[PDB]
Amino acid sequence: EVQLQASGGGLVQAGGSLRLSCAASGSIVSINVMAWYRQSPGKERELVAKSSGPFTLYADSVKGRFTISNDAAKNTVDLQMNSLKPEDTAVYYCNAEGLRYPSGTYGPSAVWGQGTQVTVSS
Amino acid sequence: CTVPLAPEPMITFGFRSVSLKLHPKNPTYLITRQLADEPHYTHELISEPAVRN
Amino acid sequence: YEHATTMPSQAGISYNTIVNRAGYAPLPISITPTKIKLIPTVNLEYVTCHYKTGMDSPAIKCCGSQECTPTYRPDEQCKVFTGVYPFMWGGAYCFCDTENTQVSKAYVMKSDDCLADHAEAYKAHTASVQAFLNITVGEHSIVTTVYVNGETPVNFNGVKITAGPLSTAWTPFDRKIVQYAGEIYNYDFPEYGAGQPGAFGDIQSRTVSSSDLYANTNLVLQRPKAGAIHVPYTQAPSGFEQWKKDKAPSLKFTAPFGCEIYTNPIRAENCAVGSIPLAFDIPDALFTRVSETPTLSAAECTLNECVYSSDFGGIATVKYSASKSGKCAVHVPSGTATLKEAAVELTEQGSATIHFSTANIHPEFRLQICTSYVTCKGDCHPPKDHIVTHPQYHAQTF
Amino acid sequence: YEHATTMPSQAGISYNTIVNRAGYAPLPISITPTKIKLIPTVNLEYVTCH
């Protein structure tokens, strides 16, 4: 079975710059989509970053500060995260969609990792 | 003097019967007897994992 | 134009045929399967490996008492005993005579060698069949991989070939499979959460790096010997090692039909069972008029040599008289004899030599030459070698 | 102790059972299926766009 492993995060002061990494393991050869989602306390799930091959997409509250890079050969995504504000604290999850198993017994479509906690202090 | 201790044998119960699973680290003597007039004593050497009813 | 054909599933041996339009020259087709693989629907369930008895330092308290703190590690066992009189290199650790307490807590953890040595469990069903074909239709030779299910055609030069599903859904694998070191065995391992000591599956892990494992090693703590700080533990030997010493023979040598197994992904191939049907859809632009191909007159057979062996062992000299020099296909409509070549080059007034295979003591077969028919007949001699190193090229008629 | 029961597939309704041994007091059991998922086993073929 395929899984996503999330690494990074920690406690930092505002204005810092971190990197968040999510890696895919299992029986996979190519990945159509890999994306990032954030979940703050007391609220619902929202999207942050959206990477698939060369194209990229950003939300309204994340433009100009966070950059997403994807490596299909390693099946990893690296979210270079900069210009911290107090509202950015949350638990971040990495999602993969449109998995093309290498025949590769067809199985579940989407996956969800445990995620990593990011906390920022004023 | 020192003497080795065998692992605790696995007991499972059934109607008028007991199944013993044994996994010896070394060859060992298993001896069994019946508490009635006729003992039917059984003495056996076991050196491989086994199940005995 | 729709045409139907059948193929006994077997690699190596080629196949020759001609599609005969009532008013145009026959169009030849040649087929050669290279590899016929059969991949199952296999879903991973768990993994196992050698375990290591995790043992902390003993917790000694001297003239007092202690408590058990559960670390909640898998298959953890904790115990406290009294009346211990420990020793050290520099004399006595304590001065008390009794009331001393020592606590032991033991567990199991995955060995460092899990990455390179570990047995995988697998649930198999729903075999899907794939093939590599080398096909030439109207001197258009191609080598291609094709999905031989009931859909997914492959098109080239307008010709659309569809290989239908197999007539038999037999598979060499059983429902539960065990993989290790590139060898495959059909074994009935116990399912997740039901492992037993002294047998396979005592230690249970969802994945290689799950970091959450279930375990029944039946670990039992024992009273340490007096005058020594240590912790004796007893447990059944490794069921993985017991299975390693048992190791019934491999499926690679036990499977019926002689099916060979390779696992880059799990797959089986090159073993003959059943037949694959082929459906041709030919566009109407590939058909050539008769006058543009050679036509013959007064053609006759002669059988020069006969050996009805496994290999081609019948040589036939055909004497003809042609209006033109040009290649044409030669076909035997029946299964009485199978030819070697797909086409033969043809002179104006020469003679042709044809190699074929038959299993008939007294063959009498009608060959189809470029546009006409001839009836070859004769008797044949047995072979000399009792065993050969290749399969049969022909069928066994009743 | 072996026991068998049936629960009609539906969410939002609690379901009650009792295990009745001869020599012990009956044991009640209450089960609520919060969410039942129907996960197809699915594959990808191709993608399209403008």
mmCIF file of C-alpha atoms in Angstrom, chain C residues 7-246:
data_model
loop_
_atom_site.group_PDB
_atom_site.id
_atom_site.type_symbol
_atom_site.label_atom_id
_atom_site.label_comp_id
_atom_site.label_asym_id
_atom_site.label_seq_id
_atom_site.Cartn_x
_atom_site.Cartn_y
_atom_site.Cartn_z
ATOM 1 C CA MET C 7 -4.234 -19.331 -31.278
ATOM 2 C CA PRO C 8 -3.034 -22.001 -28.810
ATOM 3 C CA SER C 9 -1.293 -19.967 -26.108
ATOM 4 C CA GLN C 10 2.393 -20.817 -26.529
ATOM 5 C CA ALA C 11 5.446 -18.676 -27.260
ATOM 6 C CA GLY C 12 8.145 -19.266 -29.862
ATOM 7 C CA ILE C 13 6.257 -21.184 -32.547
ATOM 8 C CA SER C 14 5.128 -18.931 -35.387
ATOM 9 C CA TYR C 15 1.754 -18.956 -37.148
ATOM 10 C CA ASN C 16 0.966 -18.438 -40.844
ATOM 11 C CA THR C 17 -2.410 -17.765 -42.453
ATOM 12 C CA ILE C 18 -3.936 -16.192 -45.564
ATOM 13 C CA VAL C 19 -7.223 -14.288 -45.707
ATOM 14 C CA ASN C 20 -8.829 -15.222 -49.030
ATOM 15 C CA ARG C 21 -11.177 -12.745 -50.671
ATOM 16 C CA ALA C 22 -13.333 -14.411 -53.321
ATOM 17 C CA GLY C 23 -12.035 -12.141 -56.108
ATOM 18 C CA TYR C 24 -8.638 -10.836 -54.950
ATOM 19 C CA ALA C 25 -5.283 -12.356 -54.099
ATOM 20 C CA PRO C 26 -4.987 -13.854 -50.585
ATOM 21 C CA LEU C 27 -3.434 -11.496 -48.043
ATOM 22 C CA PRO C 28 -0.884 -13.196 -45.739
ATOM 23 C CA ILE C 29 -0.633 -12.776 -41.977
ATOM 24 C CA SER C 30 2.128 -14.055 -39.694
ATOM 25 C CA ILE C 31 2.035 -14.008 -35.884
ATOM 26 C CA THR C 32 4.741 -14.791 -33.315
ATOM 27 C CA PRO C 33 4.078 -14.392 -29.566
ATOM 28 C CA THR C 34 7.255 -13.546 -27.649
ATOM 29 C CA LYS C 35 6.177 -13.365 -23.984
ATOM 30 C CA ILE C 36 2.738 -14.111 -22.509
ATOM 31 C CA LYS C 37 2.655 -12.723 -18.961
ATOM 32 C CA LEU C 38 -0.108 -13.129 -16.367
ATOM 33 C CA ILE C 39 -0.103 -10.527 -13.575
ATOM 34 C CA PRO C 40 -2.493 -10.900 -10.596
ATOM 35 C CA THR C 41 -4.486 -8.353 -8.630
ATOM 36 C CA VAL C 42 -2.207 -8.409 -5.565
ATOM 37 C CA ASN C 43 -2.695 -6.137 -2.538
ATOM 38 C CA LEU C 44 -0.125 -5.956 0.253
ATOM 39 C CA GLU C 45 -1.399 -6.599 3.788
ATOM 40 C CA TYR C 46 1.606 -6.708 6.133
ATOM 41 C CA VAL C 47 5.297 -7.509 6.628
ATOM 42 C CA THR C 48 7.347 -9.419 9.208
ATOM 43 C CA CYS C 49 11.005 -9.905 10.129
ATOM 44 C CA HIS C 50 13.388 -10.916 12.921
ATOM 45 C CA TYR C 51 12.625 -9.415 16.330
ATOM 46 C CA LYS C 52 14.967 -8.311 19.110
ATOM 47 C CA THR C 53 14.277 -8.592 22.841
ATOM 48 C CA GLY C 54 14.271 -5.023 24.118
ATOM 49 C CA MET C 55 15.553 -4.975 27.693
ATOM 50 C CA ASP C 56 16.223 -1.823 29.702
ATOM 51 C CA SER C 57 18.519 -1.624 32.701
ATOM 52 C CA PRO C 58 17.061 -3.302 35.819
ATOM 53 C CA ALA C 59 15.473 -0.836 38.255
ATOM 54 C CA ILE C 60 16.859 -1.616 41.725
ATOM 55 C CA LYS C 61 15.603 0.133 44.866
ATOM 56 C CA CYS C 62 17.356 -0.709 48.122
ATOM 57 C CA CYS C 63 15.243 -1.208 51.258
ATOM 58 C CA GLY C 64 12.058 0.125 49.735
ATOM 59 C CA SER C 65 9.371 -0.597 47.149
ATOM 60 C CA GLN C 66 8.688 0.074 43.473
ATOM 61 C CA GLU C 67 5.828 0.345 40.994
ATOM 62 C CA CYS C 68 5.252 -0.624 37.366
ATOM 63 C CA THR C 69 5.068 2.138 34.749
ATOM 64 C CA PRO C 70 3.631 0.849 31.417
ATOM 65 C CA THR C 71 5.513 2.254 28.436
ATOM 66 C CA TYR C 72 2.781 0.662 26.253
ATOM 67 C CA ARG C 73 5.398 -0.907 24.007
ATOM 68 C CA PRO C 74 4.138 -3.965 22.081
ATOM 69 C CA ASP C 75 3.908 -7.206 24.078
ATOM 70 C CA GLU C 76 5.413 -5.493 27.110
ATOM 71 C CA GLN C 77 5.849 -7.478 30.326
ATOM 72 C CA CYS C 78 6.679 -5.847 33.670
ATOM 73 C CA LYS C 79 7.421 -7.476 37.016
ATOM 74 C CA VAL C 80 8.804 -6.610 40.455
ATOM 75 C CA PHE C 81 10.494 -8.994 42.895
ATOM 76 C CA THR C 82 11.801 -8.641 46.444
ATOM 77 C CA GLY C 83 14.601 -10.263 48.412
ATOM 78 C CA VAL C 84 17.436 -9.402 46.010
ATOM 79 C CA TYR C 85 21.069 -9.203 47.170
ATOM 80 C CA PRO C 86 22.928 -7.741 44.176
ATOM 81 C CA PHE C 87 26.691 -7.583 43.699
ATOM 82 C CA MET C 88 29.158 -5.419 41.781
ATOM 83 C CA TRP C 89 32.817 -5.472 40.814
ATOM 84 C CA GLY C 90 33.624 -3.255 43.799
ATOM 85 C CA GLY C 91 31.798 -5.344 46.387
ATOM 86 C CA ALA C 92 28.146 -5.139 47.419
ATOM 87 C CA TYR C 93 25.869 -2.598 45.750
ATOM 88 C CA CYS C 94 23.684 -2.578 48.889
ATOM 89 C CA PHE C 95 24.159 -3.284 52.579
ATOM 90 C CA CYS C 96 20.522 -4.318 53.244
ATOM 91 C CA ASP C 97 19.845 -8.042 53.801
ATOM 92 C CA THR C 98 16.190 -8.146 52.678
ATOM 93 C CA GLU C 99 13.387 -5.790 51.549
ATOM 94 C CA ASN C 100 15.417 -4.887 48.444
ATOM 95 C CA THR C 101 13.266 -4.676 45.306
ATOM 96 C CA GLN C 102 14.151 -4.993 41.624
ATOM 97 C CA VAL C 103 11.893 -4.262 38.654
ATOM 98 C CA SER C 104 12.228 -5.615 35.108
ATOM 99 C CA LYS C 105 10.263 -4.476 32.053
ATOM 100 C CA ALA C 106 10.835 -6.205 28.716
ATOM 101 C CA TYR C 107 9.473 -5.802 25.197
ATOM 102 C CA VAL C 108 10.177 -6.584 21.524
ATOM 103 C CA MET C 109 11.414 -4.327 18.720
ATOM 104 C CA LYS C 110 12.149 -4.761 15.028
ATOM 105 C CA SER C 111 15.668 -5.891 14.203
ATOM 106 C CA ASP C 112 17.997 -3.503 12.393
ATOM 107 C CA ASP C 113 17.975 -5.927 9.431
ATOM 108 C CA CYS C 114 14.289 -5.430 8.567
ATOM 109 C CA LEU C 115 15.048 -3.485 5.381
ATOM 110 C CA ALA C 116 17.137 -6.182 3.677
ATOM 111 C CA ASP C 117 15.543 -9.307 5.229
ATOM 112 C CA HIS C 118 11.754 -9.405 5.559
ATOM 113 C CA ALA C 119 8.920 -11.641 4.350
ATOM 114 C CA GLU C 120 5.915 -10.002 2.678
ATOM 115 C CA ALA C 121 2.307 -11.212 2.736
ATOM 116 C CA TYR C 122 0.060 -10.893 -0.307
ATOM 117 C CA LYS C 123 -3.586 -11.472 -1.261
ATOM 118 C CA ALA C 124 -3.950 -12.556 -4.894
ATOM 119 C CA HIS C 125 -6.905 -12.894 -7.276
ATOM 120 C CA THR C 126 -8.149 -11.532 -10.612
ATOM 121 C CA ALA C 127 -5.373 -12.419 -13.023
ATOM 122 C CA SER C 128 -4.970 -10.093 -16.013
ATOM 123 C CA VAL C 129 -3.078 -11.372 -19.055
ATOM 124 C CA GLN C 130 -0.719 -9.341 -21.250
ATOM 125 C CA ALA C 131 1.411 -10.306 -24.234
ATOM 126 C CA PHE C 132 4.167 -9.141 -26.560
ATOM 127 C CA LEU C 133 3.396 -9.928 -30.211
ATOM 128 C CA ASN C 134 5.418 -9.797 -33.430
ATOM 129 C CA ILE C 135 2.833 -9.575 -36.221
ATOM 130 C CA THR C 136 3.212 -8.969 -39.963
ATOM 131 C CA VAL C 137 0.083 -8.301 -42.045
ATOM 132 C CA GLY C 138 0.751 -7.498 -45.691
ATOM 133 C CA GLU C 139 4.540 -7.219 -45.207
ATOM 134 C CA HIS C 140 3.947 -4.687 -42.394
ATOM 135 C CA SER C 141 6.037 -6.187 -39.594
ATOM 136 C CA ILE C 142 5.631 -4.799 -36.069
ATOM 137 C CA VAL C 143 6.624 -5.739 -32.519
ATOM 138 C CA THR C 144 4.180 -4.419 -29.943
ATOM 139 C CA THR C 145 2.714 -4.935 -26.486
ATOM 140 C CA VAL C 146 -1.060 -5.425 -26.470
ATOM 141 C CA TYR C 147 -3.783 -5.708 -23.834
ATOM 142 C CA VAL C 148 -5.420 -9.009 -24.783
ATOM 143 C CA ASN C 149 -8.555 -8.327 -22.750
ATOM 144 C CA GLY C 150 -11.829 -7.949 -24.654
ATOM 145 C CA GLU C 151 -11.082 -4.323 -25.579
ATOM 146 C CA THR C 152 -8.092 -2.006 -26.128
ATOM 147 C CA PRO C 153 -7.177 -2.599 -29.790
ATOM 148 C CA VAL C 154 -3.827 -1.641 -31.301
ATOM 149 C CA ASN C 155 -3.901 -0.024 -34.749
ATOM 150 C CA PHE C 156 -1.213 0.271 -37.423
ATOM 151 C CA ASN C 157 -1.620 1.077 -41.135
ATOM 152 C CA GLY C 158 -5.384 1.096 -40.521
ATOM 153 C CA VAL C 159 -5.478 -2.587 -39.525
ATOM 154 C CA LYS C 160 -7.114 -3.007 -36.102
ATOM 155 C CA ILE C 161 -6.281 -6.189 -34.161
ATOM 156 C CA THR C 162 -8.178 -7.156 -30.997
ATOM 157 C CA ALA C 163 -7.112 -10.100 -28.830
ATOM 158 C CA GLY C 164 -10.065 -11.397 -26.832
ATOM 159 C CA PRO C 165 -10.074 -12.782 -23.291
ATOM 160 C CA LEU C 166 -8.748 -16.224 -22.440
ATOM 161 C CA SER C 167 -11.044 -19.240 -22.549
ATOM 162 C CA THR C 168 -9.725 -20.332 -19.117
ATOM 163 C CA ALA C 169 -9.397 -18.241 -15.950
ATOM 164 C CA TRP C 170 -6.998 -20.677 -14.254
ATOM 165 C CA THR C 171 -4.157 -19.141 -12.243
ATOM 166 C CA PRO C 172 -1.054 -20.763 -10.694
ATOM 167 C CA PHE C 173 -1.340 -18.727 -7.486
ATOM 168 C CA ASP C 174 -3.466 -19.466 -4.428
ATOM 169 C CA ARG C 175 -5.453 -16.789 -2.620
ATOM 170 C CA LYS C 176 -2.713 -16.059 -0.032
ATOM 171 C CA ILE C 177 0.939 -15.785 -1.102
ATOM 172 C CA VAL C 178 4.212 -15.171 0.745
ATOM 173 C CA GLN C 179 7.163 -13.403 -0.902
ATOM 174 C CA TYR C 180 10.770 -13.468 0.297
ATOM 175 C CA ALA C 181 14.152 -12.906 -1.373
ATOM 176 C CA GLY C 182 12.600 -13.184 -4.836
ATOM 177 C CA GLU C 183 11.003 -16.616 -4.291
ATOM 178 C CA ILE C 184 7.260 -17.276 -4.181
ATOM 179 C CA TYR C 185 5.391 -19.825 -2.060
ATOM 180 C CA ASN C 186 1.691 -20.587 -1.567
ATOM 181 C CA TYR C 187 1.284 -20.620 2.220
ATOM 182 C CA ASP C 188 -1.544 -20.114 4.724
ATOM 183 C CA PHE C 189 -0.189 -17.465 7.066
ATOM 184 C CA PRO C 190 -2.433 -16.317 9.951
ATOM 185 C CA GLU C 191 -4.121 -12.975 9.384
ATOM 186 C CA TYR C 192 -3.278 -9.667 11.096
ATOM 187 C CA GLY C 193 -4.088 -9.615 14.801
ATOM 188 C CA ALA C 194 -4.210 -13.421 15.202
ATOM 189 C CA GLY C 195 -0.524 -14.330 15.417
ATOM 190 C CA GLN C 196 0.566 -17.176 17.672
ATOM 191 C CA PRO C 197 3.890 -17.942 19.387
ATOM 192 C CA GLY C 198 6.336 -20.379 17.861
ATOM 193 C CA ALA C 199 4.931 -19.964 14.346
ATOM 194 C CA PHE C 200 4.919 -17.552 11.424
ATOM 195 C CA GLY C 201 3.320 -14.196 12.149
ATOM 196 C CA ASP C 202 4.290 -13.884 15.816
ATOM 197 C CA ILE C 203 5.371 -10.283 15.118
ATOM 198 C CA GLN C 204 3.052 -8.204 12.953
ATOM 199 C CA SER C 205 3.582 -4.875 11.179
ATOM 200 C CA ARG C 206 1.380 -2.988 8.727
ATOM 201 C CA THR C 207 4.346 -1.799 6.636
ATOM 202 C CA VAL C 208 8.139 -1.760 6.661
ATOM 203 C CA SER C 209 8.196 1.641 8.420
ATOM 204 C CA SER C 210 4.776 1.569 10.089
ATOM 205 C CA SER C 211 6.284 2.157 13.567
ATOM 206 C CA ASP C 212 3.302 0.394 15.179
ATOM 207 C CA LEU C 213 3.558 -3.387 15.560
ATOM 208 C CA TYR C 214 1.489 -6.115 17.200
ATOM 209 C CA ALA C 215 3.216 -9.070 18.831
ATOM 210 C CA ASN C 216 2.656 -12.404 20.574
ATOM 211 C CA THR C 217 6.077 -13.822 21.448
ATOM 212 C CA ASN C 218 4.757 -14.957 24.869
ATOM 213 C CA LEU C 219 7.614 -13.276 26.710
ATOM 214 C CA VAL C 220 7.944 -14.451 30.327
ATOM 215 C CA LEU C 221 10.186 -12.858 32.950
ATOM 216 C CA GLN C 222 12.036 -15.057 35.445
ATOM 217 C CA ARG C 223 13.649 -14.597 38.851
ATOM 218 C CA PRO C 224 17.342 -13.673 38.375
ATOM 219 C CA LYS C 225 19.986 -15.769 40.080
ATOM 220 C CA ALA C 226 21.125 -14.551 43.484
ATOM 221 C CA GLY C 227 24.175 -12.314 43.693
ATOM 222 C CA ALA C 228 23.907 -10.924 40.160
ATOM 223 C CA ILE C 229 22.173 -7.937 38.540
ATOM 224 C CA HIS C 230 20.504 -9.311 35.405
ATOM 225 C CA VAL C 231 17.083 -10.158 33.982
ATOM 226 C CA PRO C 232 16.299 -13.660 32.635
ATOM 227 C CA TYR C 233 13.582 -13.914 30.004
ATOM 228 C CA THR C 234 12.031 -16.890 28.222
ATOM 229 C CA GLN C 235 10.205 -16.951 24.898
ATOM 230 C CA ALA C 236 9.521 -19.319 22.040
ATOM 231 C CA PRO C 237 12.115 -19.404 19.217
ATOM 232 C CA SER C 238 11.554 -17.340 16.072
ATOM 233 C CA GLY C 239 8.728 -18.826 14.033
ATOM 234 C CA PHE C 240 10.240 -17.082 11.023
ATOM 235 C CA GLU C 241 13.394 -19.162 11.511
ATOM 236 C CA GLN C 242 11.320 -22.318 12.000
ATOM 237 C CA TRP C 243 9.579 -21.608 8.680
ATOM 238 C CA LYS C 244 13.005 -20.876 7.173
ATOM 239 C CA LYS C 245 14.155 -24.361 8.184
ATOM 240 C CA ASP C 246 10.899 -25.938 6.957
#
